[PDB]
Design a protein around this nucleic acid. Structure first.
Ligand SMILES: Nc1ncnc2c1ncn2[C@H]1C[C@H](O)[C@@H](COP(=O)(O)OP(=O)(O)OP(=O)(O)O)O1
Ligand SMILES: [Ca+2]
Ligand SMILES: [Ca+2]
Ligand SMILES: [Ca+2]
Ligand SMILES: [Ca+2]
Ligand SMILES: [Ca+2]
Length: 901
DNA sequence: TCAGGTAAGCAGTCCGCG
DNA sequence: GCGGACTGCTTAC
């Protein structure tokens, strides 16, 4: 087999690499890598190395990496560019793996671990590590085993061994319900003292050294805690055994308002699953506790126990250990679904970076572009310092607030990357500038044609047309991968709808789910069998379809994020190829494209309707348009349609056969106007939206920019079994809105769009009447909490104190002296509730850590003093008032002359 | 919130507005 | 009471 790296490090003048050799075995080597860097040289000097602009370079081979680094410094001292890859391990990987890497995940050791630490004096600070580690569960992907290290004897209590038999029993049997499918995979090791636990753990670690290390909050908690605890007990050298090269560094993580410390373990790639989730999931959650995320992703109930976590080991060690094991399993279950580890490995090996670098698009692209250029003996420029400067972004159309009955939407496929490819935007393809006219002049095609030679953007930039830039070349490759995965995602989605339809008529039989590949549209034969399956088999198929769709979503949206990151990287001062000429070339072209095509679509539709000056495009944002289809529907007449699906077909056909050809013609003209290299503006139909046929539903509404709701029947070719709301920006979509309020507001919107005014008024009256019974957590607002210290003045709100920060200070006074009460963590999220006049907390709100119940010693007082009226008005009524006035509707029935009877 | 761009919405504070 | 200047937070792209 072809070899592949596992990890790579520079330690002094040595490269330390762990790798899989040609026989599939893990090996480690130290290599005295001699790096090369480059300097510009005279034309008369024969060379095969050229910078990206075609200027000749001489290669400078160094005795060692430190010599190379010192040379860079001296070149700065002289004032001359020092060219080439200055991150020497990336150059080492490029030299060592000079081919597309084919990796085998089954040979990569993926460790997932979680530790427990009993602490009677509050949160166990990792940097102090003053409390014993009393449990470690460590799952190894190669062994497929959960290794459990259990401390029986502690200063905080002596306990009995954990029982696997009790662990397997139902909660209703007094057991822990450790899933039966992992029971046989547990390797349980009890220890009489902490020193032997940790020594054995380190020996185990040497034997089974993680390549990828993950878990929940492992980078901020588990790793620093284990490292510091071992350091405290045994000394530094023993703690450094966590690194296979015995090298570690305390790394200071700085944010806007403070810093924290993590431990870098050389020769290990730490991918904390919380950070994987935050980057790759495209959610924003009210809380990031594992119990909250597990419930969200897997629909598993919260791990329940009595009393504080600090007394759980002494009161119920059995449950203590079981929940440690389950917590490790939950992360593995999330990953089986979301496949973020597989994503990281894919992207990492593609770019030829340290796997943990997938968190940085700048580093990822720097390595992709470097490897690409290196193949052509081209030499990358030196990174430079740039002051951060603002620059212009997308255009967003100001919509007229209103109901909109029938709507078809269209938007560009991979807009910014397609602009890059079309215009040929790259560092080395810059050809010059042209004198710019107002943007309006290009939009309306009255401005002079920018160039008869070069490919142009309306920001004034011109680009070569003879060859593709390295940015268009490399972005195309990742775009093509994205497209393949999106194909699989959409097929799984369509397949899902086939199953949902069949579930309307399940068969009374005993059978199995069909063995099918959900990434491909079901054949006629599969469809026929599905129509004969039981509800049990259908639901199992639906679950598998949806898992396939999730896998496709992960693969596609994060490849989309990567290529969109390259467009963004051109406006990031840390990027090697930072250039505001190129960043603005993209964004300004985007602004032109949207407004150009708005004009074109308006012109086309006024023509087919025999009108003049009417606006069919009601809205657009960045690369999208929303077209009113009322007149198209009315041209055939609603009476002519058999059912909803009938007019959806008609609009689908109209969009595909009339709109899209018109749109394509408009963009082809724009391509030629800008003299672009290749037409790649593909604005495909997204949504077909409208009320159910014969209903009083309003179909859709806008309140303003980035705030709208549509009742959608077909989305990018997926015809829904049931209509689905596309809601953007409104309070139902914000993590700050109370959960129960999101639900109620969503139902209000559903009723508005599908059923009409009367239905809405019915639901509002009921929600208003019953909402005080809602659980306090379900009606609490949510906010991130930054700068708590800034606004704290002797425990009281300072000037300009934010409402949520005020809440935290109220909490802090109410729990003062309690070393045990949960502390609000700076930068994390809190629930927030308003408090009625004259409450014992002495202020208008209280806040507490999100994802948790408020501590018992104030809970009853919070509940008693909760201001339900203020809560209702702020989170429910005011947004609803916004929705209904926009839609020209009333949420409360107006008096009429019929009331006289 | 270490990690990737800008546009733009709403909550809330402070304070003006005769 | 609303709105403008401003901060904070959170979305849509
Ligand atoms: N998370 C992001 N980071 C940077 N730029 C973004 C992001 N989301 C959107 N953009 C910019 C770049 C996109 O090309 C452009 C249009 O957004 P959007 O329509 O959501 O994606 P897209 O056009 O790239 O892909 P799709 O093919 O799924 O529509 O807005
Ligand atoms: Ca725990
Ligand atoms: Ca798009
Ligand atoms: Ca059937
Ligand atoms: Ca879009
Ligand atoms: Ca599309």
């Amino acid at each position: 087999m072809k070899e592949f790296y596992l990890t790579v490090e520079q330690i002094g003048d040595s490269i330390f690499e762990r790798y899989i050799d040609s026989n599939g075995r893990e090996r480690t080597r130290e290599v005295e890598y001699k790096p090369s860097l480059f300097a510009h040289c005279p034309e008369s000097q024969a060379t095969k190395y050229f910078d990206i602009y075609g200027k000749p370079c001489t290669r400078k081979l160094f005795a060692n990496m430190r010599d190379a680094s010192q040379w860079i410094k001296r070149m700065e001292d002289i004032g001359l560019e020092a060219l080439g890859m200055d991150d020497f391990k990336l150059a080492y990987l490029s030299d060592t793996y000079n081919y597309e890497i084919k990796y085998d995940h089954t040979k990569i050791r993926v460790a997932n671990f979680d530790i427990e630490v009993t602490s009677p004096d509050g949160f166990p600070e990792p940097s102090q590590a003053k409390h014993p580690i009393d449990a470690i569960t460590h799952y190894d992907s190669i062994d497929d085993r959960f290794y459990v290290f259990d401390l029986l004897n502690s200063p905080y209590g002596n306990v009995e061994e954990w029982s696997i038999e009790i662990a397997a029993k139902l909660q209703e049997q007094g057991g822990d319900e450790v899933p039966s499918e992992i029971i046989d995979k547990i390797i349980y090791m009890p220890f009489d003292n902490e020193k032997e636990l940790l020594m054995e753990y380190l020996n185990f670690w040497q034997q089974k050294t993680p390549v990828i290390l993950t878990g929940w909050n492992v980078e901020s908690f588990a790793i620093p805690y284990v490292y510091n605890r071992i350091k405290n007990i045994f000394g530094e050298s023993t703690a450094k055994r966590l690194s296979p090269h015995r090298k570690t560094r305390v790394k200071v993580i700085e944010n806007m308002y403070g810093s924290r410390e993590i431990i870098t373990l050389f020769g290990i790639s730490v991918l904390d699953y919380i950070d994987l989730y935050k980057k790759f999931s495209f959610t924003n959650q009210p809380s990031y506790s594992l119990d909250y995320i597990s419930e969200f992703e897997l629909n598993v109930g919260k791990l329940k126990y009595d009393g504080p976590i600090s007394k759980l080991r002494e009161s119920n060690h059995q449950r203590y250990i079981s929940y440690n094991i389950i917590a490790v399993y939950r992360v593995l279950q999330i990953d089986a679904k979301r496949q973020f580890i597989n994503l990281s490995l894919d992207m990492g090996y593609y770019a030829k970076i340290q796997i943990q670098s997938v968190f940085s698009p700048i580093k990822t692209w720097d390595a992709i572009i470097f490897n690409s250029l290196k193949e052509q003996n081209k030499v990358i420029p030196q990174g430079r310092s740039h002051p951060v400067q603002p620059y212009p972004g997308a255009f967003v159309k100001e919509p007229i607030p209103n109901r909109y009955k029938y709507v078809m939407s269209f938007d560009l496929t991979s807009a910014y990357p397609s602009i890059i490819r079309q215009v040929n935007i790259s560092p080395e393809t810059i050809a010059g500038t042209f004198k710019v006219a107002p943007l309006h002049d290009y939009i309306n095609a009255v401005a002079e044609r920018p160039s008869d030679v070069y490919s142009c953007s309306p920001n004034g930039m011109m680009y070569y047309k003879d060859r593709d830039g390295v940015v268009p070349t490399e972005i195309t490759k990742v775009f093509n991968q994205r497209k393949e995965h999106k194909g699989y995602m959409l097929a799984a989605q369509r397949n899902g709808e086939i199953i949902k339809e069949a579930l309307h008529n399940p068969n009374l039989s005993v059978d199995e789910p069909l063995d099918v590949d959900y990434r491909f549209d079901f054949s006629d034969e599969i469809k026929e069998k599905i129509k004969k399956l039981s509800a049990k088999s259908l639901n199992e198929m639906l679950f598998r379809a949806q898992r396939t769709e999730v896998a496709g979503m992960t693969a596609q949206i994060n490849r989309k994020a990567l290529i969109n990151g390259l467009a963004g990287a051109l406006g990031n001062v840390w990027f090697r190829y930072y250039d505001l000429r190129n960043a603005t070339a993209i964004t300004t072209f985007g602004q032109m494209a949207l407004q150009w095509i708005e004009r074109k679509v308006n012109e086309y539709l006024n023509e087919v309707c025999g009108t003049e000056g009417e606006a069919f495009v009601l809205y657009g944002d960045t690369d999208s348009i929303y077209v009113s289809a009322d007149k198209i529907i009315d041209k055939v007449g609603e009476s002519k349609f058999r059912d909803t699906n009938h007019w959806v077909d008609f609009l689908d056909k109209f969009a595909r056969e009339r709109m899209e050809p018109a749109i394509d013609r408009g963009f082809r003209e724009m391509c030629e106007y800008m003299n672009n290299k290749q037409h790649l503006m593909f604005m495909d139909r997204e949504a077909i939206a409208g009320p159910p046929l014969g209903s009083k539903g309003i179909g859709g509404f806008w309140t303003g920019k980035k705030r709208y709701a549509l009742n959608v029947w077909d989305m990018e070719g997926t015809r829904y079994a049931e209509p689905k709301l596309k809601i953007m920006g409104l309070e139902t979509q914000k993590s700050s809105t109370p959960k129960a309020v999101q639900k109620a507001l969503k139902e209000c919107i559903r009723r508005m769009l599908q059923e009409g005014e009367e239905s809405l008024q019915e639901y509002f009256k009921e929600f208003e009447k019953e909402f005080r019974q809602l659980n306090y957590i379900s009606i609490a607002s949510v906010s991130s909490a930054n700068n708590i210290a800034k606004y704290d003045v002797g425990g009281f709100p300072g000037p300009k104190c934010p409402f949520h920060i005020r809440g935290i200070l109220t909490y802090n006074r109410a729990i003062k002296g309690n070393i045990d009460a949960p502390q609000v963590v700076e930068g994390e999220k809190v629930y927030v509730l308003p408090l009625r006049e004259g409450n014992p907390f002495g202020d208008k709100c209280i806040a507490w850590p999100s994802g948790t119940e408020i501590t018992d010693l104030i809970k009853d007082d919070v509940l008693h003093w909760m201001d339900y009226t203020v809560l209702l008005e702020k989170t429910f009524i005011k947004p609803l008032e916004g929705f209904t006035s926009a839609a020209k509707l009333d949420y409360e029935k107006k008096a009429s002359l019929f009331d006289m009877f």
